Amino acid sequence: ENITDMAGRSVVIPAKVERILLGEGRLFYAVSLLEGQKPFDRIVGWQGDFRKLDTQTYAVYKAKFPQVDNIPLIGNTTADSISPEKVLTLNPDIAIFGLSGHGPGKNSELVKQLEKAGVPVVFVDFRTSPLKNTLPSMRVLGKVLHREQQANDYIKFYEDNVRKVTEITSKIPADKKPSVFIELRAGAMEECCGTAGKGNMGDFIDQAGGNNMAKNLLPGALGTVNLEKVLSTNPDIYIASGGKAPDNNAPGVSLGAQVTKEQAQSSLQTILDRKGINTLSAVKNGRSYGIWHNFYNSPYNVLAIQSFAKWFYPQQFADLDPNNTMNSLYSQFLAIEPTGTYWVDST
Amino acid sequence: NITDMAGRSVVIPAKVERILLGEGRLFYAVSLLEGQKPFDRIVGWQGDFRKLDTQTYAVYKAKFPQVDNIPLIGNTTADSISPEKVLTLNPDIAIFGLSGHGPGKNSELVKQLEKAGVPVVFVDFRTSPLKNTLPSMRVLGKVLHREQQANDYIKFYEDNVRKVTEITSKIPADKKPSVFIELRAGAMEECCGTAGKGNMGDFIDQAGGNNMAKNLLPGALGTVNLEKVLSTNPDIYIASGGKAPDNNAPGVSLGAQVTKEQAQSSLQTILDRKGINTLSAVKNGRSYGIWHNFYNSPYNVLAIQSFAKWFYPQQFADLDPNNTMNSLYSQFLAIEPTGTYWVDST
Amino acid sequence: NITDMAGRSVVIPAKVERILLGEGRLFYAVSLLEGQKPFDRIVGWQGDFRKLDTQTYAVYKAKFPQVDNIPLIGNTTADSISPEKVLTLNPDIAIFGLSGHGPGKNSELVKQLEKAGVPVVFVDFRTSPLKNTLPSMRVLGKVLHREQQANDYIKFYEDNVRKVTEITSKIPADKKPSVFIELRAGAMEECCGTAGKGNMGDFIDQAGGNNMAKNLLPGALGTVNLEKVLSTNPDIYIASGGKAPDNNAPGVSLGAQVTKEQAQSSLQTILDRKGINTLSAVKNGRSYGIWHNFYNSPYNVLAIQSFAKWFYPQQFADLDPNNTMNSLYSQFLAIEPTGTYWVDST
Amino acid sequence: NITDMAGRSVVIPAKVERILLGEGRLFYAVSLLEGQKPFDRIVGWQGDFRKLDTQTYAVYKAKFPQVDNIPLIGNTTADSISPEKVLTLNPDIAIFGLSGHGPGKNSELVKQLEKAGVPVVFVDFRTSPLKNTLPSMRVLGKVLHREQQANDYIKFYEDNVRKVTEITSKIPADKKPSVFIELRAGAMEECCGTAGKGNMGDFIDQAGGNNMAKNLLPGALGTVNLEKVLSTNPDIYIASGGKAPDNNAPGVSLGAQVTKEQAQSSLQTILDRKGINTLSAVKNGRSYGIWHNFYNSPYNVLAIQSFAKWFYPQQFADLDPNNTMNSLYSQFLAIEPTGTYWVDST
Numbered sequence A: 001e002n003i004t005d006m007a008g009r010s011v012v013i014p015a016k017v018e019r020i021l022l023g024e025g026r027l028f029y030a031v032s033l034l035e036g037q038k039p040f041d042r043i044v045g046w047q048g049d050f051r052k053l054d055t056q057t058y059a060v061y062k063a064k065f066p067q068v069d070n071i072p073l074i075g076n077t078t079a080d081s082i083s084p085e086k087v088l089t090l091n092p093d094i095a096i097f098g099l100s101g102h103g104p105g106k107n108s109e110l111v112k113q114l115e116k117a118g119v120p121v122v123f124v125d126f127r128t129s130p131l132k133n134t135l136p137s138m139r140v141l142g143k144v145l146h147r148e149q150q151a152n153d154y155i156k157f158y159e160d161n162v163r164k165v166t167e168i169t170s171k172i173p174a175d176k177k178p179s180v181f182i183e184l185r186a187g188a189m190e191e192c193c194g195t196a197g198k199g200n201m202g203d204f205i206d207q208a209g210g211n212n213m214a215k216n217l218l219p220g221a222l223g224t225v226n227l228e229k230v231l232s233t234n235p236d237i238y239i240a241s242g243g244k245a246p247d248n249n250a251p252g253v254s255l256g257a258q259v260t261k262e263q264a265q266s267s268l269q270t271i272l273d274r275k276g277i278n279t280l281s282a283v284k285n286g287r288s289y290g291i292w293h294n295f296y297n298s299p300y301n302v303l304a305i306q307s308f309a310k311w312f313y314p315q316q317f318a319d320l321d322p323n324n325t326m327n328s329l330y331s332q333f334l335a336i337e338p339t340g341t342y343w344v345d346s347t
Numbered sequence B, C, D: 001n002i003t004d005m006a007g008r009s010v011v012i013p014a015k016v017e018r019i020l021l022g023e024g025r026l027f028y029a030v031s032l033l034e035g036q037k038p039f040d041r042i043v044g045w046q047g048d049f050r051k052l053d054t055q056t057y058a059v060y061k062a063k064f065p066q067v068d069n070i071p072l073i074g075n076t077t078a079d080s081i082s083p084e085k086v087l088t089l090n091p092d093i094a095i096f097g098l099s100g101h102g103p104g105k106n107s108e109l110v111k112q113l114e115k116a117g118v119p120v121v122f123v124d125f126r127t128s129p130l131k132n133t134l135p136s137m138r139v140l141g142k143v144l145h146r147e148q149q150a151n152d153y154i155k156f157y158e159d160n161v162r163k164v165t166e167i168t169s170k171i172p173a174d175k176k177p178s179v180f181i182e183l184r185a186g187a188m189e190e191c192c193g194t195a196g197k198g199n200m201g202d203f204i205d206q207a208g209g210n211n212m213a214k215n216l217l218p219g220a221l222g223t224v225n226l227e228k229v230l231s232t233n234p235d236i237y238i239a240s241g242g243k244a245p246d247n248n249a250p251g252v253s254l255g256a257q258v259t260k261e262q263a264q265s266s267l268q269t270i271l272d273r274k275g276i277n278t279l280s281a282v283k284n285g286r287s288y289g290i291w292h293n294f295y296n297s298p299y300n301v302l303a304i305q306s307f308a309k310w311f312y313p314q315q316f317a318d319l320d321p322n323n324t325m326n327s328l329y330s331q332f333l334a335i336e337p338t339g340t341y342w343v344d345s346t
Ligand SMILES: N=C(N)NCCC[C@H](NC(=O)c1cccc(O)c1O)C(=O)N[C@@H](CO)C(=O)O
Pocket: A077, A078, A079, A099, A100, A101, A102, A105, A184, A185, A194, A195, A222, A293, A296
């Protein structure tokens, strides 16, 4: 059969799939929602970003599935480090790639090599245009991986849990919305400050009824705004993203499966104590928050949209709990138990 | 002739120059009428303003040292008022409160004054602020011949309250936060004082909150036990106080001579008390301090706004009670606004 | 005692609480000193701020409705000021401008005030901004007892101007672009109003531009005919305006309530006028709009910067006048920055 | 205490209970202030509302039959008002219009009332709606002690007008459509009544139209000959009327008791008249009907919106003046909106 991927390309659905290639490792998150209690059964190989840039979620899956260590790494954390030779010798029967990210895009040579080898390629997207692409991506993955039921179940769950936010924020007029700046991998980049424009976590700010101060500063989904521009705009709400492991002395916010509330609050505070940042009205007024970075490329991003709405309008979403949503997500779909801290408030 | 807050008819004097204040802090209503000559027409007052509002007192003393020479007709309780000292001041009007630290409608002193031919006016900012605050000012305007100042203050008040009520009057009950207000928190012998259907409860109602003690109490004021608070575990905790900074007694420091630091530090002591410190609202940082004397003052629009910002922070992001306060002072009063009348927990 | 901008010695009042503004838009200098209480000390003002700055007025009214009750001593001309209404406000200081829509150093009203024992201070942001802006603020600081605010603003101003002059002071004349500024472009009976050696001309000088009218005119303001502009055919065209968005009269829309799109649309109308539209600067996109009231405001550092960025685009690509405005507002003012104070042609 | 629309100072009465309406249709401004008790304070009125607004009258009569007992001080002209009947109603305030079917600022009756000690207030929705509508409501608020209702209505009005001006203020003159408005079209002896720089002309201006009579006429109202209209051949034709459905006199049927099909049929008659029917605007279907009494009513924001949607159909496709009217009625009035106040040609 045939379907349209997120690059507009038609893909012939394989009769049976047993050798999935992951162009970006963290595309595993979309796969995990379909594979039930057998998450790694059909993965022939993956980019090393999941294992190296998601060490916490990795370790949790390793403790329950030690065979994860033996899935081949086709590269490190950049598209340019992928050996096309190692890829082809795994004889994949499907390759899942992202329109953007740490893996090959629609115009890469590897995509063309795979087309010459007779291997179907599917483009998904949770990163450039999450709002447009997240649900269509899951529907498509459902069809090509023969997990239509799991996919449709997850779409219903997602739509319902997002509708809990949008029923309220879709009617709020622009002049009542809080200004928001999201600093991606805050503290951890060479040059401050990474953020999202019209795309990526910007889509989440939009949905949650916020006003992204970088929406109109930037052409793309990702970009950079200077510290002074942030200070000058002086937004209502400051959000920092990170995924740093607890026992990592490098700069950044600690969030993820092995992070405690106190490690998340302490490390957010370091981030908020930085020169310039610490004079923001949002920081002084305590409207300062942390969000787990990898939500920037995951269909679990409904958790971030909900955390954002609850920060943007605390009393209108007093009754909404993203922790229940994660637990409903894990119990319904996944094969591990939820642990750690995926979001934090400054004390 | 006018009808006071006790339903009684009062013949308005032709000229008033000797006002008796049954409760000292009724001065607050008078101050909105007297412009730059606040104490010119006060023959005497209950000692509650001087002794239970030491900060606001000291500020007025520095600009008007003659305030120290206004006679104190008693201390802080109705029973300590000498009716003899009262009558020798030959008042031409007496202003009393339906409730509080001064005589009520059925006291002997009220009857003595009626026998002496002295008009008595009952106001209320304390039992039923919502029903009574504006009618009280209207009445004080008429009997003190300051109708203009009164009407000016009513317009100011209604406008600044309507900023809140036009939003919160349409909010359904199930979207409202539960609220407990602990009056003079930390400072009473037995915890915990609060307000029912009345007093600061009216402010919670107006600001679109849900007062957990509304149905626990028959009156405007009363007491709920600590364990009942813990068990109800309300969304939002509010502590009232008016303690002076350099007062080692227990309570929250708020008022004209209090810095935000002192207010924040002393609120924290209050929030660190056994039991209180495990409240969800305290842990989640939805914990606040409000200046106690707003429990009996037509300046109470400042508290209604502070509550609304606490109950729905974003919907009232743009509302600033410091600006309401500054406008109030500049338009009506004879002193400069200083100190901290509200605080948020660190 | 201090020396004002007219060279006159002025005795500093011990306390000031009743400031008279000879020109309403002199408020801008006062606003930098009064913090969160902008209108607290203004007894009255010329009607130019309320009538010729409707946008900035409306923004302050929404936060301080008491601004509507400040008395207007006249309309928009010195000759419409009733000296009687002025004197009954019993000012304790009067602030006047060497030039503009209010009384000057030789007016009768200035003499009346001297007879009444009222100190008069002359400032200037309009005739000789470069010489006078900072000295004016220093002086206002001393006579209004806001030396701290004044010195803070001077440091901010000098630093933000030095960002421009460090570069443009070393540029030789032959590398400078020729510039014509058309004040209230489109909106005068006879084209074309502009500035000579003074007013916005000072800004062109500082920003390293070459004002084509510098030597055509004797004074700070004057008129140059359309044909003279066409013939000089300058490298850069700048139009000033302050027209409200919803005003169908001719002129450029700029100010607190103007969007970038309205500013551009209305600048374009101005650039589409016969004669103007054949200028090389217009055809080549070197066409800009600046908010007119910068012609008399110590916020004029915002214009010196917008000019420097138009005169030398890459040399000041890192300079942002919007950040400077926001630092100005947050540090000194009581309102939030909105609208469009400068625009580039599409 | 307040300045009316004639520039005259009027002393705000302490309590008003006997309002005299110089022009009956000034009721529309009063109705926005009186909530559910519209006629409670009206001692008498000009007969224009009852006789020239039969539809809106009948609707109020069905809910309030006591409206029939309000005294008529005259018919539909200032000259038919008995000053004697007026004075025996012992009004405590009289509201008059700068222009219209009632007395003006120089009438004898105004002087009689001044001799009788009765405050007179001039409002205006007719000569200079743009300048005067909102100031008129502000003033009526103060003198009738309905400041809250007035301020509420001003905010509503400004917001609903801003929906139009946000768009039309940035449209350049050369892109605007030419417009002719024929007042009480078909119903006058001599064609064609219209508005100049004033009256419905102000609405055309605001809605981003170009009134072809703006410079043909000195006043707010006047007459332009059919041939002049034909020759100018404007982009858009608008006819006003308020004729009752069951009235076979010439004119457009619009108002509270008119269906869309009766408004369309009667507009068509108006558009089928010799000369009119050769207009480009008529042939192209840019032909419309507007309810005449908007020519003197603070509900005129409904016509400004209806005009903008006719001037720029797609730019205002999302704007609905019917939703605006309904928000107006529900927020402010005591009756239910019915009928057709505007119509498009089939
Ligand atoms: N290690 C490298 N040299 N490049 C990494 C490639 C992915 C790159 N990532 C980001 O730009 C980024 C920014 C903020 C926060 C993040 O977590 C990021 O991963 C990227 O997105 N590249 C884009 C544009 O080149 C793409 O592939 O389309």
